[PDB]
Amino acid sequence: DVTRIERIGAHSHIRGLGLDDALEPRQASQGMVGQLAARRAAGVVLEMIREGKIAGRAVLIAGQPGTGKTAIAMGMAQALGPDTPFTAIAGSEIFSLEMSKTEALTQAFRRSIGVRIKEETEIIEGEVVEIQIDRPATGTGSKVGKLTLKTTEMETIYDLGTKMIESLTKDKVQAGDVITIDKATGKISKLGRSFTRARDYDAMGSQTKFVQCPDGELQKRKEVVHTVSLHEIDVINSRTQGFLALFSGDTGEIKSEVREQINAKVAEWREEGKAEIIPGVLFIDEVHMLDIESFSFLNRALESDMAPVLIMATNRGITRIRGTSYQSPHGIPIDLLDRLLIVSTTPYSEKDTKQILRIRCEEEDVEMSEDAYTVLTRIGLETSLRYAIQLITAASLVCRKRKGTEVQVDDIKRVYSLFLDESRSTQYMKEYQDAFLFN
Amino acid sequence: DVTRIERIGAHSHIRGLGLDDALEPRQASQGMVGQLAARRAAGVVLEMIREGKIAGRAVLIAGQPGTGKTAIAMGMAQALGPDTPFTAIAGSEIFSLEMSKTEALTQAFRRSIGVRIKEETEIIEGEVVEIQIDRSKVGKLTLKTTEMETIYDLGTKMIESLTKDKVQAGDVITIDKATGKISKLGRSFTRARDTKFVQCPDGELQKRKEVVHTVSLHEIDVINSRTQGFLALFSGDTGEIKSEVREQINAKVAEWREEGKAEIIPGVLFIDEVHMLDIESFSFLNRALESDMAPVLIMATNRGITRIRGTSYQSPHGIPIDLLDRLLIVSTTPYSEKDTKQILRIRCEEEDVEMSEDAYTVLTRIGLETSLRYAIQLITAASLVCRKRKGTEVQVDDIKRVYSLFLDESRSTQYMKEYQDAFLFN
Amino acid sequence: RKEVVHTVSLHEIDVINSRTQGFLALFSGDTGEIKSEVREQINAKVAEWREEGKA
Amino acid sequence: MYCQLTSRQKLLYQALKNLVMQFRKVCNHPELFERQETWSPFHISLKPYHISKFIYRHGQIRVFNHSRDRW
Amino acid sequence: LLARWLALFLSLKASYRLHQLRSWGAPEGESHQRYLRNKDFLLGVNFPLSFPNLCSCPLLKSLVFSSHCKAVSGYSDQVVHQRRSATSSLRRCLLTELPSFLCVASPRVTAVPLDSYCNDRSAEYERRVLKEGGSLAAKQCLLNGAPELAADWLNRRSQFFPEPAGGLWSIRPQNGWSFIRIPGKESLITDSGKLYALDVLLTRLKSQGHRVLIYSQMTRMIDLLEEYMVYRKHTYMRLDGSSKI
Amino acid sequence: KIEEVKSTTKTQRIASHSHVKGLGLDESGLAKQAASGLVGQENAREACGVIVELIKSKKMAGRAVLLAGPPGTGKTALALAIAQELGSKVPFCPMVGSEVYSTEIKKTEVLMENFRRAIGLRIKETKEVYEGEVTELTPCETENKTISHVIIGLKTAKGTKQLKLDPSIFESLQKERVEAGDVIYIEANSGAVKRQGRCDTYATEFDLEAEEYVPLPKGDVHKKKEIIQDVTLHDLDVANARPQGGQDILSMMGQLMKPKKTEITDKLRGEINKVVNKYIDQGIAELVPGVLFVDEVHMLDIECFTYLHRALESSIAPIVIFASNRGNCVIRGTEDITSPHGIPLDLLDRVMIIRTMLYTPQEMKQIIKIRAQTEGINISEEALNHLGEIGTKTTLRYSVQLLTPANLLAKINGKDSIEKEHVEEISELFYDAKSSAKILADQQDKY
Amino acid sequence: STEIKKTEVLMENFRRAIGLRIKETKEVYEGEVTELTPCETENPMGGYGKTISHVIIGLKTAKGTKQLKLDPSIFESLQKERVEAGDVIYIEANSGAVKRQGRCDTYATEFDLEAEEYVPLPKGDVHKKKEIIQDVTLHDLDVANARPQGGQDILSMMGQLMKPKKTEITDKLRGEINKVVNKYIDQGIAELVPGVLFVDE
Amino acid sequence: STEIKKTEVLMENFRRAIGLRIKETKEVYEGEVTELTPCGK
Ligand SMILES: Nc1ncnc2c1ncn2[C@@H]1O[C@H](COP(=O)(O)OP(=O)(O)O)[C@@H](O)[C@H]1O
Ligand SMILES: Nc1ncnc2c1ncn2[C@@H]1O[C@H](COP(=O)(O)OP(=O)(O)O)[C@@H](O)[C@H]1O
Ligand SMILES: Nc1ncnc2c1ncn2[C@@H]1O[C@H](COP(=O)(O)OP(=O)(O)O)[C@@H](O)[C@H]1O
Questions:
Q1: Which run of H or E residues covers position H4?
Q2: Beta bridge partners of B329
Q3: Nearest CA to ligand 1 atom 10
Q4: Residue E182 near residue F196, CB atoms below 8 Å
Q5: Burial E230-243 (b: 16+ CB within 10 A, else e)
Q6: How far is F155 from E90, CA to CA, in rounded Å?
Q7: Closest residue of F to D7, CA-based?
Q8: Cβ burial, residue A331 (10 Å; 0-12/13-18/19+)
Q9: Which residues contact A232 (CB under 8 A, 6 or more apart)?
């Protein structure tokens, strides 16, 4: 019935790397299964990322199409967790028309260094008993007033200041409102109405659900942790009142003098203990999309002390570097490939293939017989693994449409006849070779 | 001593274009040497510029790299001097992201033709002896030169100006009588007590000064383009300037020229490395050189029979025959040994360094083995090793040391053939 | 006192709805990349006016 | 109780290593040696760009063409 | 561009009046399935998320949170604590303004806007008018937002519940408009390891409730200690030898 | 009785050149064998020695050097060694060759931004300022009425003054919402106003207000001070091109709009040059011409290379350093033309080339040692010898990159130092360019 | 597109293919204002000449006439709005805001010309209520957050006189919108319809 | 051009080549102003 915005996608079953505390990969844990060599290596660089002492270290994950390069990249994203920044970029995303390639990479780097700030402030959180606002008969405008607030335990009177009076009256504050005022910020906020004073009332002044009266002492502390990237610190500093640019992305090619100055002041906030710095990860997925212009930026960007730990992934053999004639490994110039460690992934056995299909069926809420798993394991070796992962839901839906409770072997043979493997479509493309366009 | 922004650069030694009245170049003077053919030719072009009467004309300075083709073009600019526009660009400087490639040449052609005018102004200048004011308003001023004094009744627009700008007794000031603007020059030495200090003006207080002024023809376009034009002159916001505005301004200046209220002063465009232009840009030079407002232009190139940019066609100089037919080509020539040593002496004067006569001989050998320019770069580095040595003078073993520290292109290329697989791409 | 007939092309309704003063762009030419949400709203509204008999 | 020098103090402390109360002052608080100045950007003006009276009278298309511009 | 601005400012007034008429009645066709009406091509109000509907609906106003003059970081969880018992609770997904101290870059140089001097009595009035701002209508339009908003702002001291200003006066950047900087008083702590150690001892001792004396050698140091002790509002007294008997 | 201390502030992060501290010369200009964190390269370090003399001489304009040699030979490390040897004062402007390809301004002009950024200037700016509590604020008016003049009363611990001020300062005070009892600072050169907050004398006049109060300022109300500014010529070029300074509606507006770059006119640099030559002739200034370093120069366009001819000859221009790592490569933007170092021969005559050697195994060991005592990690002798062994087969960077992965394995099984088995195990996980290119060329049917 | 990068045109269409279906009440008071009648308390508070407990606004619609009672702060706003008896007005019951539509059409003859378009009398009761099931794509939320439309600041007016432009919306705005639509989907306030993106060619 | 499409630069130049020829009398008054008197009423 209920359905949240994030749902079951191509890696949603992965929840970590499944390593023990001795940093050895378990055969099946946290959704990862098999693939020992690359999971081991990912564990080491994850530990290097949690250590964070060293800048601009990098990794390239390589191997066949459909062999868990991106699985291991998401595995370490979940093992690293939400408190430390991980930026996923597909390599095409840097080809902006708003900004040049070296800008788009400098943003992708600096979006991946977190500055973490505790904002601790004192709040008053209470139910309004009464307010008096006093206004001159004409005069210069020296407004004055008093306000009173309650909790289920305590109440008090405040003599109001001049800027407080405009911030209160701006939000139509009234008796029976429950409000939370920040003493350092000078900002009100409204939680709702209490059930009481809203009876001594008129044709409607508001319509919302009531809130219970606040408890304990009327004045109390709040604490917030912000996680602010270097990129948004640069953007906020690019133009005064620039705060909307964080969402719209419209600030192009930021002045170098901003970055030079923020690199200093972020170091000062570490030496003051005023802010933590938490270097994170940049995952440039499909990096063989970068031009040789962009790789030559990475050669000299990836040596700044503010560089994040950088992870490439790619599936290409000896192929020419995009935007040039030259053939090279992974589609990358050796100028860069000399600088970063390569983690090598491996093809899958029957055991790994069946075990991947079984953990996928668990996350998709599917029951299948061991015979249906046997034929789907065959299909996942006669054809690439992602096609088998694409028959599972179709077979569960055909099973559901005939009102079965468990997927049988002939539900998969039905679905296999219905949705084609590439190797079968590219075979039928030979009978209709006169009818398809531009062979 | 202190250093201003301009320091010793690759052409600083050239202080003119050394010529006799006959337009014959003596062997070495005004800081440059040899090139007797090319410098006699540059003398004739310098007179065509200074005469101004013939419009839309071109010279191409061509020849082997390092042969002074930028040197004579830079010396010609020093010899021409102020009071005639000269403007330089490199050929890859017209490829704007923000403006048409064809319009960028149209700006370069019209930065380099000047309009000149003269205007007369009532200017008052003097030491302010005393100033007085009341609460409309009335007030009184007194001014002094070394040769007269006056008192004056002030009007209201002056009273507000003198009081706004805090003019005080003992200042020396200039008043723009037409405009009410005050410039203060300093204080009188007799009131320097209780900073800048200066003597009173000579002559009478109120002088009807004549000012001559000059505006590039393009600089009139930018003034016309926007609610305030002149900001776009400095900030570079001038772009795609509407061609009907030029169709009016060229015709307006063409009547000021003949009603005699202005005169036009043809200048120079120096479009260096001309082989960078596309065939699209040459197609503009083909036709923009055939109108009365066109300057003389100097173009410099060092290319053989070469592919012209934007096509597969090969032609002399890297320029289409289309455009070479408009113009006169002056050839530089490769230097002899005598001229090579004499350039090295003049660079040693301009960098202020002593070196041994046999040091000049081995450096001349190096120069002839490395097409001059590399030997010129060794001069400074040799003097720095001599300074490290606490030497009085550069010796042969300072040069032989520095020749092993810094490679020329030929030895660098030869060493790159030893490790040929270690460098990337081949 | 009269009713009158106007003919106005669908692009003009698309431009007028693109920004607060969009009709200036009908003459200035200075508009492009109209958001697809506007064009499909104009289909629904112009079909609706035709069913309501109003256009 | 022991204290490090701060990242700013270490610079001034080395300058003193390169008169003991002049030394104590910096170690105690650097505001005893030099107070942190109220910084502000460098402020500059060019010459005003001089436009001739002749160009201002006869030289703008907004003015000399106004009778045509009406049409 | 002045008439552009006034015709815009009126169009926003017209939008709220149009939205009510557009959304609360359905009287078929105006002469029985015939004839359109004034404003019928303005469809920018029919979108559910358009400003009049978004302000009339109480709830969509919370899904369009990034208003143009607030420093919103995004949503976070928050923690709140009682002073007594140290009991605390968590608030799930609430808006946050960014901290008051990320705005710290500055131009190294700030030049005066360039000005064209000219040698003529008629010409110099024109640059004067430009230095003032070239009409009181256009000046009020940028400075206070529209000429009605300026006429209102001149008397808003006499009104109980005023609207926000619309102009440049609607904006207030975290440092003000000037880049000039006076050092933040926290710097007293972070410049001295002794003063940083002292602050952790005074927070230790204040939490324990002990009464404390501080001894120093230098009256210039006692000035530094006093400015710290004032800044943290500790209560303070001093008796240097320059104090009277 | 008790001893107490604390320290928990994190270090600066360790980086791929942070062990470079200088050129490691002796006073003759010879290179020491291993010093300032470097090893080897004496035939290049001596030459860089002559170039740090060349920068510190100030005399030259537009001299340029090219560091050439294979990947991993230290060319960027030597360019950083030059930067460290100059210290903080002289500007060193780093750049990467692919940064010229802006989407906002032509490639040819992005180089002039860097050329104008690599010339530094120092200024004695004698500012003067008013500050204090505003005790009075009273405007004065003139005929058709409007404001004309202003009275502001200021107070400080050392006195009070009733100032007479320009109506633009009243417009500026109104903008900052200044009122009686506020503590303010006014920069009199610039019309700029900063409102700090109400004076502490009023600190409890309300139970709630949005303010944070401040102490009454010390010294006289009106005072002047000798501020020392370090600035580049580019920072003069740009500030005049889109000015945020002054107090008018136009500057206040132009500060908010998107800060696009713009193709700065030569005439503006002519004005800045004329201005700064006056500040030098007044003795207000000092000039500090520094370095522009263009790493990866080999992919500047032939547009850029042909512009560099005119730039490096300019009597204004800074000293330049290039790096390249390429053989007889095809020059980008030409398609036809092959040349040394990816650089046109026409430019290659204008640079003093410094040649960079490859390392012997016995230099690999010494860099790896110096690197390990920079990463903060301890290593046993046969383990360090095995990184050297790997360095003979693979490349210098790879033998360095194995260090901290091995240190993690060492402390994951509780050891104090890298042992050979930790390096030997790490080499089985992390392939290099050579070994990966083998398996990738064997399996080439599947990629 | 010329405005924006290829991959962002795909990412925006990936966000068009997901819809909220979000249901909310509208409640409003509307009608011709028959009278504005402030109501005093015969005892004032100490030191003041007279005091008002509430304002009565008489409102008329085709279904009837009703005296609404309102707090006295309304009278300040009813002289910001230039209201006079026989205007038609509305008040947002969820918000307390008040607005003027124009003189009521019954008076469209008291001059042969007057400079306002006359408004027909509202029909239904003086107090109106309905539910509406609104629908928005996540892409509509992406644009409405990336470029706000309320005009009470110079950045918004400048940004609305300037040409509208497609902009490369950050992964952060996508992130924050995801975080808040979860806050409402968990509360049952908002339905969600994962839709379809169809690309031909 | 870099601000408009190629076909627009053709169309602008095709429209520069067609002229209107409008006749009007020039009428200049000039001199010292001796008085000003303003004279709905
Ligand atoms: N070791 C693994 N354990 C679990 N699931 C895996 C594993 N390897 C791959 N997958 C799953 O199989 C599919 C293919 O992996 P993917 O990451 O997309 O391959 P790649 O990035 O290498 O091309 C995905 O659905 C992924 O979640
Ligand atoms: N005739 C000369 N007299 C003095 N110096 C010269 C002369 N010719 C060339 N030079 C010097 O030698 C350099 C090489 O000549 P140049 O004109 O720059 O050649 P090119 O333009 O082909 O690169 C000059 O820049 C200048 O330093
Ligand atoms: N001579 C050296 N002394 C110290 N460190 C060096 C030296 N040569 C190379 N390195 C180090 O080895 C690595 C490779 O050198 P680098 O400058 O990055 O090579 P490249 O010029 O090809 O880009 C860097 O970590 C660098 O600091």
A1: none
A2: B60
A3: A68
A4: yes
A5: ebbeeeeeeeeeee
A6: 47
A7: F9
A8: buried
A9: A111, A246, G172
